[PDB]
Amino acid sequence: FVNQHLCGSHLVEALYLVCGERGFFYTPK
Amino acid sequence: FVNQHLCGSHLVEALYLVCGERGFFYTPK
Amino acid sequence: FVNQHLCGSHLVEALYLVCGERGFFYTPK
Amino acid sequence: FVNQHLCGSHLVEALYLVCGERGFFYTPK
Amino acid sequence: FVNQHLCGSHLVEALYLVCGERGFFYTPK
Amino acid sequence: FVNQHLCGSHLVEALYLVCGERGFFYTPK
Amino acid sequence: GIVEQCCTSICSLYQLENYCN
Amino acid sequence: GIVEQCCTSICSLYQLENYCN
Amino acid sequence: GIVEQCCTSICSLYQLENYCN
Amino acid sequence: GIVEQCCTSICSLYQLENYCN
Amino acid sequence: GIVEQCCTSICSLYQLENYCN
Amino acid sequence: GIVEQCCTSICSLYQLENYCN
Numbered sequence: 233f234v235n236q237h238l239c240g241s242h243l244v245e246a247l248y249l250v251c252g253e254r255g256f257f258y259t260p261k
Numbered sequence: 262f263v264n265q266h267l268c269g270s271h272l273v274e275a276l277y278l279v280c281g282e283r284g285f286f287y288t289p290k
Numbered sequence: 291f292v293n294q295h296l297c298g299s300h301l302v303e304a305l306y307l308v309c310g311e312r313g314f315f316y317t318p319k
Numbered sequence: 320f321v322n323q324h325l326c327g328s329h330l331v332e333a334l335y336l337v338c339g340e341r342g343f344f345y346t347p348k
Numbered sequence: 349f350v351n352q353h354l355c356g357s358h359l360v361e362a363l364y365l366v367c368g369e370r371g372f373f374y375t376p377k
Numbered sequence: 378f379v380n381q382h383l384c385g386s387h388l389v390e391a392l393y394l395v396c397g398e399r400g401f402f403y404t405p406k
Numbered sequence: 407g408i409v410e411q412c413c414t415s416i417c418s419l420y421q422l423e424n425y426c427n
Numbered sequence: 428g429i430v431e432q433c434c435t436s437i438c439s440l441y442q443l444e445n446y447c448n
Numbered sequence: 449g450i451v452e453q454c455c456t457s458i459c460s461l462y463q464l465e466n467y468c469n
Numbered sequence: 470g471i472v473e474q475c476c477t478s479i480c481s482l483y484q485l486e487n488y489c490n
Numbered sequence: 491g492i493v494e495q496c497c498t499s500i501c502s503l504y505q506l507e508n509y510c511n
Numbered sequence: 512g513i514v515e516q517c518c519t520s521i522c523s524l525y526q527l528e529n530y531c532n
């Protein structure tokens with residue numbers, strides 16, 4: 233529900249930072 | 262400057278929002 | 291409470307992006 | 320560059336925090 | 349669920365806007 | 378300078394994530 | 407209002423649009 | 428508007444508060 | 449790609465939707 | 470610390486001000 | 491997946507990098 | 512400091528760690 237939705241918003245922020253030029257795949261599953 | 266870097270941070274946000282359960286691939290390049 | 295507070299934060303960002311040039315009204319009560 | 324768009328994103332976050340329970344209209348010109 | 353970590357992220361964002369050019373120390377201890 | 382203001386907002390989020398339990402000292406001046 | 411609607415369950419983009427001007 | 432007013436020089440908390448309901 | 453398309457002028461959420469899985 | 474003070478109940482911007490340099 | 495691994499317990503940046511391209 | 516260093520070009524995660532306590 234909402235707390236997983238909010239958490240995913242931060243997860244993608246952290247991936248953006250850590251992955252750098254490599255980028256990333258975000259797939260809830 | 263770091264303009265592209267700040268822009269990408271907002272882009273992954275907006276992708277997170279619009280893509281929903283599909284998720285997305287973020288690849289600069 | 292805190293949770294609602296953190297949620298409202300993401301809500302205004304989502305409104306910003308979805309509403310575009312229309313703008314939006316955030317009235318939490 | 321999408322500077323007004325990125326600025327407005329931080330502006331609504333700032334308004335969210337300042338206005339608290341009063342809420343706010345965001346009405347871009 | 350990860351809610352102190354998520355709260356802390358919003359907290360730094362809010363401190364940033366309150367503190368301005370003064371800056372701030374964030375010590376999670 | 379607003380450009381600096383927006384950059385700093387992303388800097389503190391990045392520091393929040395990278396510094397972990399250490400915390401960080403944000404001092405723009 | 408929006409908090410009650412959208413902080414207990416995820417609102418769709420179209421639901422959020424109700425709050426646009 | 429707010430973008431014109433606040434996107435070159437920083438609006439303080441105080442100034443931003445003028446836009447609250 | 450996304451940076452070239454969307455960082456010099458604004459992409460709508462519909463345009464961004466092209467980059468969804 | 471701040472997390473204890475401000476993550477179970479909401480801190481005002483004035484309360485937040487305590488942590489500025 | 492990522493939500494399962496990282497929304498219940500905190501993932502470090504090192505753990506998160508496992509999801510990079 | 513951090514602005515002169517990291518707002519004029521992109522800092523690596525190791526460069527940002529200079530500013531950790």
Ligand SMILES: Oc1cccc(O)c1
Pocket residue numbers: 234237278297300301304411412413415416417418
């Ligand atoms: O229901 C919600 C809550 C927060 C952000 C969002 O896009 C939807």
Ligand SMILES: Oc1cccc(O)c1
Pocket residue numbers: 326329330333365379382433434435436437438439
């Ligand atoms: O002038 C501004 C622009 C964006 C955020 C903010 O807090 C102030």
Ligand SMILES: Oc1cccc(O)c1
Pocket residue numbers: 268269271272275307321324454455457458459460
């Ligand atoms: O064109 C853009 C750039 C960054 C965020 C966004 O929603 C759109």
Ligand SMILES: Oc1cccc(O)c1
Pocket residue numbers: 336355358359362475476478479480481
């Ligand atoms: O108490 C809090 C926690 C997080 C953000 C904020 O503005 C206040």
Ligand SMILES: Oc1cccc(O)c1
Pocket residue numbers: 239242243246350353394496497499500501502
């Ligand atoms: O485990 C998590 C969840 C969300 C953001 C993050 O950096 C780590």
Ligand SMILES: Oc1cccc(O)c1
Pocket residue numbers: 249263266384387388391516517518520521522523
């Ligand atoms: O140089 C920078 C500026 C802002 C965020 C970041 O991760 C790096």
Ligand SMILES: [Cl-]
Pocket residue numbers: 238239296297354355
């Ligand atoms: Cl959150």
Ligand SMILES: [Cl-]
Pocket residue numbers: 267268325326383384
């Ligand atoms: Cl920005």
Ligand SMILES: [Zn+2]
Pocket residue numbers: 238241242296299300354358
């Ligand atoms: Zn959040």
Ligand SMILES: [Zn+2]
Pocket residue numbers: 267270271325328329383387
């Ligand atoms: Zn930004």
